[PDB]
Amino acid sequence: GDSVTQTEGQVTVSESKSLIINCTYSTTSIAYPNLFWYVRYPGEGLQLLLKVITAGQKGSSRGFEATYNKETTSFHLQKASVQESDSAVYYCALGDHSGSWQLIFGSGTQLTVMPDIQNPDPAVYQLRDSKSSDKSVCLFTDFDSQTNVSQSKDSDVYITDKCVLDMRSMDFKSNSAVAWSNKSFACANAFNNSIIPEDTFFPSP
Amino acid sequence: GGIITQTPKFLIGQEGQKLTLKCQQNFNHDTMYWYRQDSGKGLRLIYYSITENDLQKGDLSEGYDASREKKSSFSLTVTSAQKNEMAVFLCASSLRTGANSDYTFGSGTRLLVIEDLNKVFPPEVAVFEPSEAEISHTQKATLVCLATGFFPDHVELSWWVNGKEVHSGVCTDPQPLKEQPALNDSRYALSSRLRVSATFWQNPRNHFRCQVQFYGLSENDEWTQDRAKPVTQIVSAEAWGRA
Amino acid sequence: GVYATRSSAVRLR
Amino acid sequence: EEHVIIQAEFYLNPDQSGEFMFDFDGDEIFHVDMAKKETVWRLEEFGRFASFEAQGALANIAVDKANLEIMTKRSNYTPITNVPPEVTVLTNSPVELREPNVLICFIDKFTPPVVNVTWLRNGKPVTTGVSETVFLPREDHLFRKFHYLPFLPSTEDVYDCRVEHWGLDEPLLKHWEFDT
Amino acid sequence: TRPRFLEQVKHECHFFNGTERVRFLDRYFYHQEEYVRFDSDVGEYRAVTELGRPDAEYWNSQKDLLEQKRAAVDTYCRHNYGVGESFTVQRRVYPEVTVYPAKTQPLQHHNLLVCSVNGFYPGSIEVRWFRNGQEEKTGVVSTGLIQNGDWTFQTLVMLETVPRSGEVYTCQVEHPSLTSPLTVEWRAGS
Ligand SMILES: *[C@@H]1O[C@H](CO)[C@@H](O[C@@H]2O[C@H](CO)[C@@H](O)[C@H](O)[C@H]2NC(C)=O)[C@H](O)[C@H]1NC(C)=O
């Protein structure tokens, strides 16, 4: 019907591991399609990444590659070893060889590649406010990238998503998630679900 | 050195209001586009203008109106924001060669429509000093900043160490948290963390400041409540090193 | 079967 | 096998008339009717085996009009020198009485592509059953055209093809009769 | 009296041995004169006249436009060849043949024997004449191929001869739309 469909939602892969982002297309009015991949890095606009205009030819850019396959009517995006800088939203777009048809963009697949934590050191800490000593938040830090930090089960306690920071000066990366509350709650059990008690470190506050 | 900029980056409006979006580019591109990225999925073309004559296509029937007098400027207006919608608008331009020229996109404009402006709140910021147990265990120091109580989520958080914005060792939540499950409150919270070496934090000369740029009302807007007008403003919280 | 259209290259200015 | 497919297009000022057609070994596959914005196939059967999106033709005709305005100025408004046409009238089958036939009026080697072709039966203009073609391209980049009048061969009926072109000082009249 | 201005553009695909060898040409004209041309062998645009030099320099600076035209032998030429192949390159229509003398007159007078071949496609056809079973290649005159503009051709192959009693003249037509040659005889008679 002159359209594009690709992988829905989000895809999560580990750093330096294979990635495949499916895409396919249909055609009714476009006589000879050209196929494009567009990337949108966080806080940026879409820019062209890959582009193939000829049947059965392969286009490659920044470690990615896609093959205009007319037999399967696809254009899957592949990469052997993704880096952490590839975390972005990828869009599959469809045009015509004439250049007269406006690009038909897909819904867009979101890719987040998690870093390779070599020395996981799970621990929950309790930080106090610089102004007062009453208010306090909880920090779950230094856990492995595979840890799915489930959250927001209780409504009285808030838990954020995992976050990777990069100490570029120190060449060190680590995950972290924050939990806090307003009810008089213990930091240790705030991450009750996404925690392995035997391995994580619990200091005596 | 090419650029394509749309204004404003963040734009809150009321129902029935005539909201204008402006986009200008200095690429000498003959044709420009206006896409709408909705919350769900799909880029959808509202208007495109090849040279100096637009052509409604894709999404006019939602009630829009474009204009373009200069080759470099493509202006989009929502005839009547109706109602309570949430959408990103993207500006694109491309060269008219007869071939499939590459599209150049803008960062996007976040539009938010609400019933009552009395729901707009700047954030409260707090900084939390690193844990003493973290320092002895990892020889590193994690600061946590918390921005709470803001609406909309039109914020940019930044860390400043001794007066210069830093980037290394910083992490911000990719998306805010709805504090209350109610539709008619839905204030947000957002946290960020700045991790430094335990020695850098243990120096009482080093100054730390979490800073949150909030995008809210303008002085041109009307305010009838007793509380402070939730205008565009920075809200910040600081902490000094500790021995 | 759908016939294709070769585009005409646009003159500058 | 040896063939030539040509996608031929033109735009004329100030007449602001365009044409988009495909050509196979000298024969028209189809043309785009600019007015109705629809593909028009030379033989109706063709549309059963293939289709075509008229809007892509319209894209090129907009490009050509901008291309012409630039080129006209580039040439310091050098106009086109008219070329008058050659008209030949013939039948598609040997003429026999009371055996249906078709008269072919063939206009050739002319430019710009604007004509007035009028069939006449015994001096009277006939507008029933007539049909015509669009301007067909030539390798010397002039144009050609066909007009058709189905008829029943008579001994007292007389036909004339009236062709008016700007290259002609007088309307060209080519004649036909049962005694050739 | 208003001066006219004509722009022409011709996108040509030339096929040899089916699609084994294809050549693409992107031809731009002003008043029936070719000004700039892209050719699938040179790989870029060229100016045939000096008046089309600015366009050739400009389109040759854009790799996106060049990669579009370089690809047109495959994405345009071989594509549109396959779309219409069944009803164009494979189209076969057989002609109606009619033989008739030009003048009703006595024998042993000079005459002109017309072999009218009407309504065949394609144009490839061979037309012969035979006087009492012997092919006659002298005194033959052909009009060439006549396009009727409707995807059929016609042709008249005329024979100059002096007809004599008992002579049988035969027109023979060979055409791809026919597995066997088409023959039509004319009796001289008395
Ligand atoms: C074909 O005939 C028409 C009509 O005579 C020409 O169009 C113009 O028609 C108006 C009447 O509405 C006349 O006043 C003009 O003088 C006509 N123009 C010219 C140049 O004669 C049309 O031009 C004719 N086309 C050709 C090729 O002769």
Numbering used by the authors:
A (entry chain D): 1 to 30, 35 to 61, 66 to 70, 78 to 84, 84A, 84B, 84C, 85 to 196, ...
B (entry chain E): 1 to 31, 39 to 61, 66 to 72, 74 to 81, 83 to 256
C (entry chain C): 59 to 71
D (entry chain A): 3 to 182
E (entry chain B): 3 to 192
What did the published study say regarding this structure?
CD4+ T cells recognising citrullinated self-epitopes presented by HLA-DRB1 bearing the shared susceptibility epitope (SE) are implicated in rheumatoid arthritis (RA). Citrullination is a posttranslational modification (PTM) whereby arginine is deiminated to citrulline by peptidyl arginine deiminases (PAD)10,11 with PAD2 and PAD4 the major isoforms associated with RA12,13. Crystal structures of mouse TRAV6+ and human TRAV26-1+ TCR-HLA-DR4 complexes presenting vimentin-64cit59-71 and α-enolase-15cit10-22, respectively, show three-way interactions between the TCR, SE, citrulline, and the basis for the biased selection of TRAV genes. Position 2 of the citrullinated epitope is a key determinant underpinning TCR specificity.
To understand the molecular basis for the TRAV6 gene preference from the immune mouse T cell repertoire, we first determined the complex structures of the A03 (TRAV6-6+-TRBV13-3+) and A07 (TRAV6-6+-TRBV19+) TCRs bound to HLA-DR4Vim-64cit59-71 at 2.65 Å and 2.75 Å resolution, respectively. Both the A03 and A07 TCRs docked canonically, ~ 67° and 61° across the central region of the antigen binding cleft, respectively. Despite distinct CDR3α sequences, the A07 TCR revealed a similar docking pattern of CDRα loops that contact both the HLA α- and β-chains and maintained the brace-like conformation through vdW interactions between CDR3 Asp108α and Trp113α. The CDR3 His109α wedged between the side chains of Gln70β, Ala73β and Thr77β of the HLA β-chain helix and formed hydrogen bonds to Gln70β and Thr77β while CDR3 Ser112α and Trp113α contacted the HLA-DR4 α-chain. In contrast, for the TRBV19+ A07 TCR, the β-chain contributed 36.3% to the BSA of the ternary complex, with contacts mediated solely by the CDR3β loop. Here, the CDR3β loop in the A07 TCR docked in the middle of the antigen binding groove, enabling simultaneous contact with the HLA-DR4 α- and β-chains, while leaving the adjacent CDR1β and 2β oriented away from antigen binding groove. The A07 TCR made similar peptide interactions except that the non-germline encoded CDR3 loops did not interact with the P3 side chain and P6 main chain of the Vim-64cit59-71 peptide. Another Vim-64cit59-71 restricted A07 TCR also made very similar SE contacts, as in A03 TCR complex, albeit with distinct residues in CDR3α and 3β loops. Here, Gln70β in the SE pointed down toward the peptide and formed extensive contacts with main chain 109HS110 in CDR3α, as well as Gly111 in the CDR3β loop. Collectively, both the A03 and A07 TCRS exhibit highly conserved interactions with HLA-DR4 and the Vim-64cit59-71 epitope, albeit utilizing distinct residues in CDR3α and CDR3β loops.
